[PDB]
Write a protein that binds this ligand. Structure first.
Ligand SMILES: *CC(=O)Nc1cc(C)no1
Lengths: 244, 179
């Protein structure tokens, strides 16, 4: 993550992020809405960061410091470049919508009124088709990625050396290889929960309540299609095992 | 410094998310309660042993039968949650969650946790439950269910008041440590 963004999303809530004299000017319903929107962007920032740990710290470090086939590293980190692009673009759209809403002379005070539109573009048409295909691909290679990490950590001492080395910082406490993989699989199922609580406090403008209602339906349609597309791969599976 | 994994399972409004948040923050969030839990690694010292306990949630995965089992790999202890203000959420414990957790997690200790125990004395909880011919889950009904499903034990807590929360997680660590 970049320092500018980490500080903007450092507080526990939107109520604590904005200046108290700016908070005082708003209705309770708006503060509640803003709190859930701020949580959606704050968790998306953490998600993108998790994927940078997988691409720049783990994936690239293994290529630059170890002697493993590029196929081994690809099995440990399936779809990470595609997932990183999908979410870095989503995060850019969310952060820009917040920036546009900032009061002049302030870098912390804002209110996001439109959001449903951005959520409809992300979870509909071509962009949703690529994200859906990417998550069915990732989740079908999730178990195999885990067994491959465990096989390498117990048979390779240099891979083990590398792991103990790059995961030593305290900031990486909950971000080991297997943790990053489950963090990514769990991300998609978080969106409906956050979107439903944002919609719960967005009944003031009917265009917005309708946009968020459409967005809730689109993420659930996406999820159902990713869930249907999963067929788990096994490390060293036989053809007979598959066609049965 | 041994590493252990804990996964909490249970129906939608069983308070599993509130419970993990309240333990990892170590207080009831005063200003805002987060909608979601990412993950956490707790440093617990139970009965003299230091353990790094990784905590996970299954909230959001309840309708996705193929995505959800991806949370189970290498789990050392299962917290099987139900809410004391929802006797129907208890009926799903042996019919839905137990056979799935036994299938994907063979031989993994399961602690049945009755959440929201403060609602046993709430008047609005009793009045609404009595409309649907019901009442809060009694302590013996929870204990009998844990007994019937072959659980390692039965515990109750209140994420709202923080009572019983610390003990659930230290016990879960002990359960995870048994070979
Ligand atoms: C999840 C998903 O969209 N899978 C998919 C769609 C088409 C068309 N092919 O695969």
């Amino acid at each position: 993550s970049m320092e500018m963004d980490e500080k903007d999303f450092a507080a526990d809530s939107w109520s604590l992020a904005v200046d108290s004299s700016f908070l005082q000017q708003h209705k309770k319903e708006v503060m509640k809405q803003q709190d859930v929107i701020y949580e959606l962007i704050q968790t998306e920032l953490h998600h993108v960061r998790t994927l940078k740990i997988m691409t720049r710290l783990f994936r690239t470090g293994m290529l630059e410091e170890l002697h493993l086939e590029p196929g081994v590293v690809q099995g440990l980190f399936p779809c990470v470049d595609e997932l990183s692009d999908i979410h870095t673009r989503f995060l850019s759209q969310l952060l820009e919508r917040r920036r546009q809403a900032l009061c002049p002379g302030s870098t912390r005070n804002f209110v996001i009124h439109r959001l449903g539109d951005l959520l409809i573009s992300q979870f509909s048409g071509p962009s949703a088709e690529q994200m859906c295909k990417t998550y069915s691909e990732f989740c079908s290679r999730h178990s195999k990625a885990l067994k491959l990490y465990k096989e390498l950590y117990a048979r390779d001492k240099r891979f083990q050396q590398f792991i103990r080395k790059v995961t030593r910082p305290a900031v990486l406490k909950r971000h080991g290889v297997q943790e990053c993989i489950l963090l990514v699989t769990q991300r998609i199922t978080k969106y409906p929960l956050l979107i439903s609580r944002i919609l719960q406090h967005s009944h003031g403008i009917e265009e917005e309540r309708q946009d968020l209602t459409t967005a809730l339906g689109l993420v659930k349609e996406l999820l159902s299609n990713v869930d249907e597309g999963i067929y788990q791969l096994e490390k060293g599976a036989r053809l007979q095992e598959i066609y049965n | 410094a041994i590493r252990k994994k804990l996964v909490i399972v249970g129906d939608g409004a069983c308070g599993k998310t509130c419970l993990l948040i309240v333990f990892s923050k170590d207080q009831f969030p005063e200003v805002y309660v987060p909608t979601v839990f990412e993950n956490y690694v707790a440093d617990i010292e139970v009965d003299g042993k230091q353990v790094e306990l990784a905590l996970w949630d299954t909230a959001g995965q309840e309708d996705y039968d193929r995505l959800r089992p991806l949370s189970y790999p290498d789990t050392d202890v299962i917290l099987m949650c139900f809410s004391i203000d929802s006797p129907d959420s208890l009926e799903n414990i042996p019919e839905k969650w137990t056979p799935e957790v036994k299938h994907f997690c063979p031989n993994v200790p399961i602690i049945l946790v009755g959440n929201k125990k403060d609602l046993r004395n709430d008047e609005h909880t009793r009045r609404e439950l009595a409309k649907m011919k019901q009442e809060p889950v009694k302590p013996e009904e929870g204990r009998d269910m844990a007994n019937r499903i072959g659980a390692f034990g039965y515990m109750e807590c209140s994420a709202k008041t923080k009572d019983g929360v610390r003990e659930v997680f230290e016990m879960a660590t002990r359960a995870a440590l048994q070979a």
